[PDB]
Nucleic acid binder design. Structure first.
Ligand code: DTP
Ligand code: AFN
Ligand code: CA
Ligand code: CA
Ligand code: CA
Length: 342
DNA sequence: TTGAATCCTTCCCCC
DNA sequence: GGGGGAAGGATTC
């Protein structure tokens, strides 16, 4: 059948910052995103392994991080820079197979199904690829390999960082039963829970309960997806993918409800969203408001034509008003999202 | 306590 | 009964 090759750049942002300034290597680096809310307000985009060893990881606020390693190198996030370093590594990959996916800013699956006869040769192509990526861009990555996407990724998760691992059918059969279901791609702790108090603690357990029970607890989708992984029938193609929407949000200095106070933030958001749009014309626009208590509320509108920057501002203001109206909390975060491209 | 981008489920129109 | 689609909330990486 087929063999999937998953490539995953190690502690990426942090690493890219290390590449752009080698003096950093071997020292704990925490790449964070600072919100003008107050000094050191914000969170950790991510951190390299030195820093991570001690708990400073992605998601923890910057203040807690400095309390753990008050002496680590803290750098602001430079997405653009990372975006270009990624694009570069992404191309090198295309050279190994035109069947590439690119799931995120540091992930990509490759159907080397043809370019390889056996796993032995896959493992080889893995090193070939790790090495060529290390030579051209100075970036270390983990590579996973198996019969399908989901497993090619799991193989990687197991081998981080700067690793390479092949999961053969026997490794799969073993995993379908001994692999914790919370560690399966697509299962956030939210679904990991509903599955926990349902008896499904292992990828296999999904076979025991009747289907229409799962469909109601976690949804027809996740239901069928899980079942196939368990009966070893899962086999999704490595399809190239196109961005289906762009957007931008911004935290405000103070939380408020004053339309006029929020407007400037909204527009700042819209303005950047267009730059990103580049040459794309969106037919749908949505305004997203993160309430003072971190709950998300969004209103939107789809037009039968493209959205001009001018109209964009206009329709955005209405949609925010509609939010303040329909809600009551103070707005903490505001922004826009443009979808349904022409 | 920082974004971004893609699903899950109502719901309204109408053959 | 169900094709076709827009809205807002849910969930994941
Ligand atoms: N919780 C988060 N908050 C903000 N940015 C995040 C978060 N998680 C991930 N990111 C961004 C920062 C990273 O550079 C990139 C994600 O990297 P991730 O691929 O999942 O693994 P990584 O290789 O950088 O980490 P790892 O140390 O596990 O290998 O996406
Ligand atoms: C939205 O607001 C916060 O910003 C981010 C950014 C992430 O990745 C770039 C992110 C991830 C995860 C998560 O639970 O939260 C975030 C958040 C916060 C969200 O609440 C993951 O599991 C992977 C990335
Ligand atoms: Ca990674
Ligand atoms: Ca990744
Ligand atoms: Ca998980």
């Amino acid at each position: 059948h087929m063999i999937v090759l998953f490539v995953d750049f190690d502690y990426f942002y942090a690493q890219v910052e290390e590449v752009l300034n080698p003096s950093l290597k071997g020292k704990p680096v925490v790449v964070c995103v600072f919100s003008g809310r107050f000094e050191d307000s914000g969170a950790v985009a991510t951190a390299n392994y030195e820093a991570r060893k001690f708990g400073v990881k992605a998601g923890i606020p910057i203040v807690e991080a400095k309390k753990i390693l008050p002496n680590a190198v803290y750098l602001p996030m430079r997405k653009e820079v990372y975006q270009q370093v990624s694009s570069r590594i992404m191309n090198l990959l295309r050279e190994y197979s035109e069947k590439i996916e690119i799931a995120s800013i540091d992930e990509a699956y490759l159907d080397i199904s043809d370019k390889v006869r056996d796993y032995r040769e896959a493992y080889n192509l893995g090193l070939e690829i790790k090495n060529k990526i290390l030579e051209k861009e100075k970036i270390t990555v983990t590579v996973g390999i198996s019969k399908n996407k989901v497993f090619a990724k799991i193989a990687a998760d197991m081998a981080k960082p700067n690793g390479i691992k092949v999961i053969d059918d026997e490794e799969v059969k073993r995993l379908i039963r001994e692999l914790d279901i919370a560690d399966v791609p697509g299962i956030g702790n939210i679904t990991a829970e509903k599955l926990k108090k349902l008896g499904i603690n292992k990828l296999v357990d999904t076979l025991s309960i009747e289907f229409d029970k799962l469909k109601g607890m976690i949804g027809e989708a996740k239901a069928k997806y899980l079942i196939s992984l368990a009966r070893d029938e899962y086999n999704e193609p490595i399809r190239t993918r196109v961005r289906k929407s762009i957007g931008r949000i911004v935290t405000m200095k103070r939380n408020s409800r004053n339309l006029e106070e929020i407007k400037p933030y909204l527009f700042r958001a819209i303005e950047e969203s267009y730059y990103k749009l580049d040459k794309r014309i969106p037919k749908a626009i949505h305004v997203v408001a993160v309430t003072e208590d971190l709950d998300i509320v969004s209103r939107g509108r789809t037009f039968p034509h493209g959205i001009s920057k001018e109209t964009a501002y206009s329709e955005s203001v209405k949609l925010l008003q509609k939010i303040l109206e329909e809600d009551e909390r103070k707005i903490r975060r505001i922004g826009v999202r443009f979808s349904k491209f022409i």
